[PDB]
Each structure stands twice: as C-alpha cells, then as structure tokens.
Design a protein around this ligand. Structure first.
Ligand SMILES: [Cl-]
Ligand SMILES: [Fe+2]
Ligand code: NA
Ligand code: NA
Ligand code: NA
Ligand code: NA
Ligand code: NA
Ligand code: NA
Ligand code: NA
Ligand code: NA
Ligand code: NA
Ligand code: NA
Length: 187
C-alpha cells in the first residue's frame, strides 16, 4: 500500500502487478501511480505503432490475468466510437499529445440522439478514469498536427464492448483487435 513514483515504464508495470496482486482495485491509487509516471518516449517507442487510417491498440502487458495494459496510437483526426467498458475499470494516461474525452449517459430504450454530458481535454501525463457506472465516452485526437499516444489499463481484461450510435443510442457489439503484442505486429 506504499506507492512510490515509477522511475520508468518497466518500473510502472512492476508497481501495477503489485497493486493488482489481489481481487479488488484501489482506483485512486492506480490513478495516482499512472499519473506519477513521467512519459519517456524512448521507453515506449516499441509499442507506438501507428496506422494511417485509424487508431491502433498495442498490448504492452497482460497483467498476469488481472489487467490489460496497452498503448493506443491516434493519428491526426483519429477517434473512437462512443463506447462502454464491459463492467471493467478503465484508466487512460496521456503519453503524448492531447485527447478530447466526451461523456455520454447510458441511453434510454427510446431512440434519441445521445447528447454530450460534458467534455474535457486530457493533456500529456494526465490520467483519466472511467467505468460503466460513471457513463460512456468517446475519445478523440482532434489535432490536425500532433499524433496522440495513450496508455490504457483495463481491469479485468476484456476484448469485446459496445459501440453506440450517437443518433439513436442503439448499441452493437464490437470485438477489440490488437495491432501488436509485446512490440510484435500481429495482423
Ligand atoms: Cl478507452
Ligand atoms: Fe474507453
Ligand atoms: Na521502461
Ligand atoms: Na517517471
Ligand atoms: Na480512429
Ligand atoms: Na494510428
Ligand atoms: Na488495433
Ligand atoms: Na494530439
Ligand atoms: Na471526444
Ligand atoms: Na463505461
Ligand atoms: Na450485446
Ligand atoms: Na505492442
């Protein structure tokens, strides 16, 4: 329960394996530790694999079954769907650039446009947190000039979630695909 500042990405990962050694999750502590790591591009260049047309998901660590740690790479103008997180914890730390996070409420059964609840700009080294009881969100690199890179921790791991149609609130199931694993391209 003694949180030290992660010196490196590797150190961070080791501290995370400690924090998730058990069955439950201290959210505020995981968030603090993630925010405390100072992004060092050299340490994660291996995982920062971009695609021209959409954002990529790059597996960094499998957290001995308790979590998935991954790096997402967002080209200029790349963004996600409005999505949930499959009853898991979601931590999002910026390693490079900025991302816009837009919050949505869970839709009612009636077909209505999903109106934004709020939005915020996540900046380098900032760490955000979301879960399904908080709501839904969309994440976007709105920059025309700067690629964005983020570090995501999901616990428990999941490889499916829902995307929501902003016009209706209708949801469809989506399967998450890894662009790379441990620095190896996995087409
Ligand atoms: Cl996310
Ligand atoms: Fe998300
Ligand atoms: Na490292
Ligand atoms: Na650091
Ligand atoms: Na995209
Ligand atoms: Na990309
Ligand atoms: Na991907
Ligand atoms: Na950016
Ligand atoms: Na957004
Ligand atoms: Na959610
Ligand atoms: Na479903
Ligand atoms: Na990878």
């Amino acid at each position: 329960t003694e949180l030290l500042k992660p010196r490196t990405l590797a150190d961070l990962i080791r501290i995370l394996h400690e924090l998730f050694a058990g069955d439950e999750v201290n959210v505020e502590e995981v968030q603090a530790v993630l925010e405390a790591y100072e992004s060092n591009p050299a340490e994660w260049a291996l995982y920062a694999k971009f695609d021209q047309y959409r954002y990529t998901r790059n597996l960094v660590d499998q957290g001995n079954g308790k979590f998935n740690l991954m790096i997402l790479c967002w080209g200029e103008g790349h963004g996600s769907s409005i999505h949930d997180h499959t009853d898991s914890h979601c931590f999002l730390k910026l390693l490079q650039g900025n991302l816009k996070e837009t919050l949505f409420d869970w839709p009612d059964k009636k077909s209505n446009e999903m109106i934004k609840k709020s939005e915020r700009t996540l900046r380098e080294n900032q760490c955000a947190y979301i879960n399904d009881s908080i709501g839904l969100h969309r994440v976007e690199n709105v920059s025309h000039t700067e690629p964005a890179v983020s570090l995501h921790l999901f616990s428990p791991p999941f490889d499916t979630c829902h995307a929501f149609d902003q016009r209706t609130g209708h949801k469809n199931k989506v399967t998450m695909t890894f662009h790379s694993k441990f620095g190896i391209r996995t087409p």
